[PDB]
Amino acid sequence: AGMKAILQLILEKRQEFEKLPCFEFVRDETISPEERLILYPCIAAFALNFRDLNRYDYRDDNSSDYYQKIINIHTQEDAKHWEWFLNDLELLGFDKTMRFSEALRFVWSDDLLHTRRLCHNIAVLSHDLEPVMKMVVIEAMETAGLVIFHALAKPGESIAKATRRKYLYVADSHVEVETGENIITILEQTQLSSEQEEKAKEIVNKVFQWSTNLIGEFERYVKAHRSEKAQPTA
Amino acid sequence: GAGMKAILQLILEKRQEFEKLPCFEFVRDETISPEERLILYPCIAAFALNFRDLNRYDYRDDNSSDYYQKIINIHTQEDAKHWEWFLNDLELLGFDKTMRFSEALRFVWSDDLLHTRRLCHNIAVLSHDLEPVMKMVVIEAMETAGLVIFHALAKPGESIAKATRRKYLYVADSHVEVETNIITILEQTQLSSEQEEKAKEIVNKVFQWSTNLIGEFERYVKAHRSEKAQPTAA
Numbered sequence A: 001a002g003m004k005a006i007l008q009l010i011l012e013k014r015q016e017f018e019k020l021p022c023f024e025f026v027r028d029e030t031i032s033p034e035e036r037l038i039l040y041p042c043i044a045a046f047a048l049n050f051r052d053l054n055r056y057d058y059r060d061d062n063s064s065d066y067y068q069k070i071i072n073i074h075t076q077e078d079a080k081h082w083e084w085f086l087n088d089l090e091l092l093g094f095d096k097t098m099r100f101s102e103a104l105r106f107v108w109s110d111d112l113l114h115t116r117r118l119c120h121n122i123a124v125l126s127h128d129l130e131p132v133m134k135m136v137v138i139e140a141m142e143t144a145g146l147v148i149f150h151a152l153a154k155p156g157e158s159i160a161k162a163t164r165r166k167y168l169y170v171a172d173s174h175v176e177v178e179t180g181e182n183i184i185t186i187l188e189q190t191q192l193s194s195e196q197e198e199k200a201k202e203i204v205n206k207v208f209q210w211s212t213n214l215i216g217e218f219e220r221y222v223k224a225h226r227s228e229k230a231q232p233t234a
Numbered sequence B: 001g002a003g004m005k006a007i008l009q010l011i012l013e014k015r016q017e018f019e020k021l022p023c024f025e026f027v028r029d030e031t032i033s034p035e036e037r038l039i040l041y042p043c044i045a046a047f048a049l050n051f052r053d054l055n056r057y058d059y060r061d062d063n064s065s066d067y068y069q070k071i072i073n074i075h076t077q078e079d080a081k082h083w084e085w086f087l088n089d090l091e092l093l094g095f096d097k098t099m100r101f102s103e104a105l106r107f108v109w110s111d112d113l114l115h116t117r118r119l120c121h122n123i124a125v126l127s128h129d130l131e132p133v134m135k136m137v138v139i140e141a142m143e144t145a146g147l148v149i150f151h152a153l154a155k156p157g158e159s160i161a162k163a164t165r166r167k168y169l170y171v172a173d174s175h176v177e178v179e180t181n182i183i184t185i186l187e188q189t190q191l192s193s194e195q196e197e198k199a200k201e202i203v204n205k206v207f208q209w210s211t212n213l214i215g216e217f218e219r220y221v222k223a224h225r226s227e228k229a230q231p232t233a234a
């Protein structure tokens, strides 16, 4: 009954999460896809911190644990997508020449605090978790990720097709490989103690709270940048 | 008490080993041009701004009435203002170069600056579940390693500052002077057995993490031996 409640909590949080104004904007085919991807450079901090979360926090190569070996396999691949981010950054005309300090001031912007610190908050949440509870973190976080990338892949695929270029990050191929030997949701062959159950609730609430804080920063960046667009070239 | 006395002595011990690292003998070597010794200056980017965030977000807690946490909050306020000095001296040193956004991100998230980039993250993980007296120990150790670093860098720093007649703020005596009721002064504090052992864990991890960063700085110099500073005379 416990595990079943948690998987349901994720579904409910996903349903709130997918309705955020940011995603309504990103999905809106009456606005140019070049305007809908004006939030693209905001992902910078998040994408490479996500790589680092997978490489150095999620992964433990020496674990003999059944659950940790499956995590290790999944984090191996999920940590390769940051190159896709830098690919599409270039394609979208956002790999602009600037001073080193302009890039640093951007990454450490007070207006991208939640974006920058999302993976930090996950690593802190995860520090004392047993592998089975790290799976809940990853499933929650990946449920949020599928919503974000299913939305972003809409304008991305529109630009990819129109410019005749292969987008890799804001692209259906990203959503497909991310979704995914065993998948972590399938390890719903697991039942949780009462302790684990209240912890998994805490995890899902925070993961979606922090994910909503990031998306709120994107919505506000968009708002402060409607007077520009991605500049893809044909 | 005599448990605290052991901690303050372990910090002196750890400072004495740390002071001897090859990177510091290099930075102190007046036979090498100060432009060459500050080859490592841009490495600090991946740290100075994380140090600011550590002080704003991780150490500081504005919903606390504890005596100690209130001392912490005061100290963290000033320590969080030095990142702008870092950007000042970046430009003065000629390291505020024009580049692709992606080259700035690949710099910060370089595998060759992993320990530099993660030092403050590691400190936040260590600190997040400590009582304030124990956070005071993290901060005092960190600040002890910090003094060794800025005592060394201020040598080539002040050489360039006088030679070019420009006000250097970060690799500068003024930074070394302002970093120095003070936290050590609450060595009017007695630790339990448990706190004694955790203070030992804290002081060991701070100095190990600080050694790893300095080791990366030394490897950077060796791999970038031509990329000397290029300050301009006033």
Ligand SMILES: N[C@@H](Cc1ccc(O)cc1)C(=O)O
Residues within 6 Å of the ligand: A046, A047, A050, A078, A081, A082, A085, A141, A142, A143, A144, A145, A146, A148, A149, A178, A211
């Ligand atoms: N898929 C993202 C990572 C991610 C995962 C979960 C999220 O909620 C958000 C983003 C990437 O490759 O960068």
Ligand SMILES: N[C@@H](Cc1ccc(O)cc1)C(=O)O
Residues within 6 Å of the ligand: B048, B051, B079, B082, B083, B086, B142, B143, B144, B145, B146, B147, B149, B150, B179, B210
């Ligand atoms: N004084 C440094 C921070 C620092 C502190 C402790 C250290 O060990 C190193 C660096 C700054 O303003 O950025």
Ligand SMILES: [Fe+2]
Residues within 6 Å of the ligand: A078, A081, A174, A178
């Ligand atoms: Fe991904």
Ligand SMILES: [Fe+2]
Residues within 6 Å of the ligand: B079, B082, B175, B179
């Ligand atoms: Fe400082």
Ligand code: NI
Residues within 6 Å of the ligand: A074, A075, A077, A078, A177, A178, A179, A180
């Ligand atoms: Ni997977």
Ligand code: NI
Residues within 6 Å of the ligand: none
């Ligand atoms: Ni702007």
Ligand code: NI
Residues within 6 Å of the ligand: B075, B078, B179
């Ligand atoms: Ni102080």
Ligand code: NI
Residues within 6 Å of the ligand: A124, A127, A128, B128, B129
């Ligand atoms: Ni904890």
Ligand code: NI
Residues within 6 Å of the ligand: B224
């Ligand atoms: Ni290099």
